[PDB]
Amino acid sequence: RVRALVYGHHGDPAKVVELKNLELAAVRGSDVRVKMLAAPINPSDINMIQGNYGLLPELPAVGGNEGVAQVVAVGSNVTGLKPGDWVIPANAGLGTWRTEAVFSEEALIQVPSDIPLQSAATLGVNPCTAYRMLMDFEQLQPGDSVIQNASNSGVGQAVIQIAAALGLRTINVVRDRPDIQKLSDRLKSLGAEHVITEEELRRPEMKNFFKDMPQPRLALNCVGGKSSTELLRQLARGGTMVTYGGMAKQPVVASVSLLIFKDLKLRGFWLSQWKKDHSPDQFKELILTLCDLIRRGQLTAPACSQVPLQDYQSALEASMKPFISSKQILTMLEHHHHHH
Amino acid sequence: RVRALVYGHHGDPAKVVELKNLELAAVRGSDVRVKMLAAPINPSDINMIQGNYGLLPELPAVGGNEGVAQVVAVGSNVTGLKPGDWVIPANAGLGTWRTEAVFSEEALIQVPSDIPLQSAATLGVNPCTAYRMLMDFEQLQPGDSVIQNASNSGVGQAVIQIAAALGLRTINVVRDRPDIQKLSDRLKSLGAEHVITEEELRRPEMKNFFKDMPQPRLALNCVGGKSSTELLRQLARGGTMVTYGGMAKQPVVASVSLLIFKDLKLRGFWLSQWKKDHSPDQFKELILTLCDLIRRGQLTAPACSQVPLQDYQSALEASMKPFISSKQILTMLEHHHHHH
Ligand SMILES: [Cl-]
Ligand SMILES: [Cl-]
Ligand SMILES: [Cl-]
Ligand SMILES: [Cl-]
Ligand SMILES: [Cl-]
Ligand SMILES: [Cl-]
Ligand SMILES: [Cl-]
């Protein structure tokens, strides 16, 4: 009776993902039966399906790496999860775009159920990525600056909020658009100090434009090409640019002068590798940290369009969009307002 | 009575460098009068004159940053240099392409005069750069591998020798040429384990071609563009590519997959900054290290064309060449064999 979004081959998700009926496994001693409640469509999910990603589950595969589920049944040896608990995947690759599944308890992390459901559904990827990038590369103190691009993305909005919660001052690059003023005010209300366009970023002058803030030692990039070079250019001598997303045909470009004379560092960050390298308990501590930020009103989930699993086609469609209408989240529960 | 190579404006060294007659300063309390013996033409010297470099001495300026000189006279307060001592600049910017000069003793580092003159003349830049890059980024142990490009360059040959002296195993990329076999044997006799072309490097297969050696954790780059990407591709997960030279129009290009999934690091190295950041004593210790490698027969100076200061025009000409005939060194002493 399980309904799932399964791809049999790599390609355009719009074309290769289909809604199939699977049957449930048996609940072994250390297994957990879950009912998925919600699961976002994230760039990494799209890349997995397209076949350009560092982790590519065996085909045919279930789409999605992130989501929150409710524990329904547990195996005879399990003492640390109970019916009713909320859980999220311990790492990528699990396949979250479905109604029900049976997972080893070690594959799951309990999340408090007092936070909003949509927050739990999106806690495990974007906020974790943001927090990790802010902590793991440069030691930042209150008053220090951070610059990033794609600032309106899931990670970008989480960086704004978490950076603000850390007392950091953000310069947030976005793409040029007609409703820039509205976007700017919105990001500022999440805590952004300044919001600038890629066009502004490219100006020679702009490097020393915001006189009343320190040069950033950390830059967060997911765009690449010339844009990534312009982000680099904004760094203080010895600073680091961390790349956490992008495209195959838009490599990161670093001028020889910036590497040599400005002693800049280029790094990557991959949350799945972090999770692989660390214990479930260490990931749980990160989750609890973020849960506290949520309860303290220091982190809130972005604007989301809830789409029933059945209408997944339109949800995929929307997340492909260059200027993404609004984040898409697949929901397996009926809400107070029906969505046809 | 001083003869010097002086540029009044930035441009093609072939065009903007001229041989002028200067007069000597007075020897103050902490000053030293030196007679230059030899000075190489290095890429950094060319970049200074072209006006694309991180350090650009005030114009009109004397060409050259490297050389060895003999101390002739010293100021009344100097107790640590004596007539007859060999000296080299403590850092870049000094102006070494001339017959005589007066320098603050703090601007100079004594070098033992038991090593060959041409070695002393070239010790301060290329071997230092090689050694520093091998030590300062990845902790390499005997048996570990290093990959580099422009392996036939001054730095490249020094890396081969110093890496060999450290018990490291080198993969040495060079440009495709008709006399590749000869070049390969030559680099192997300096200690290179393998010598491959840029063409070979670009082959997908070649990444796991040398079965009997470990993947390198360190890559040394001075080429940029696609070549730099192909060098990166050879690194072990978590490895570092250090860039120490290149051109403005050939930035380093790093694919998103390599940064993210392979967790590669890109860095720069600038010897002048190292020297600025460290004490003269720390630079002297590096020099003594390299002097020991020389006396131990573990480091030898590359093949050099000695050119009198007067014939500097042809020396500049030769060092511009894409495939540099052979390294050019300006000499201020007559040798056993006259050079018209
Ligand atoms: Cl952007
Ligand atoms: Cl602003
Ligand atoms: Cl680093
Ligand atoms: Cl993940
Ligand atoms: Cl090469
Ligand atoms: Cl070989
Ligand atoms: Cl130097």
Residue numbers in the entry:
A (entry chain A), B (entry chain A): 42 to 381
Question: What did the published study say regarding this structure?
Answer:
Mitochondrial fatty acid synthesis (mtFAS) is essential for respiratory function. The last step of mtFAS is carried out by 2E-enoyl-ACP thioester reductases MECR and Etr1 in human and yeast, respectively. These enzymes are members of the medium-chain dehydrogenase / reductase (MDR) superfamily, catalyzing the NADPH-dependent reduction of 2E-enoyl thioesters into acyl thioesters. The structure of MECR shows a bent cavity of sufficient dimensions to accommodate acyl substrates with carbon chain lengths from C4 to C1619.
G165Q variant did not provide crystals under conditions previously used in MECR crystallization, so completely new crystallization parameters were screened. Both wild-type and the G165Q MECR formed hexagonal crystals at +4 °C in a condition where the main precipitation agents were PEG 6000 and NaCl and the pH was 4.5 as described in Material and Methods. Crystal structures were solved at 1.85 Å and 2.02 Å resolution, respectively, in the trigonal space group P3121. The asymmetric unit contains one MECR chain, but the enzyme forms a dimer via a crystallographic 2-fold axis. In the MECR structures presented here, the first N-terminal residues (residues A31-A41) are not defined by the electron density maps, but the C-terminus (till L374) including the six residue long His-tag sequence is seen well. Otherwise, the current and previous wild-type structures are very similar (RMSD 0.70 Å for 332 aligned residues). There are some small differences in certain loop regions such as 240-252. In the current structure this region has high B factors, but residues are still well defined by the electron density maps. In the wild-type MECR, the substrate binding cavity can accommodate fatty acyl substrate longer than C8.
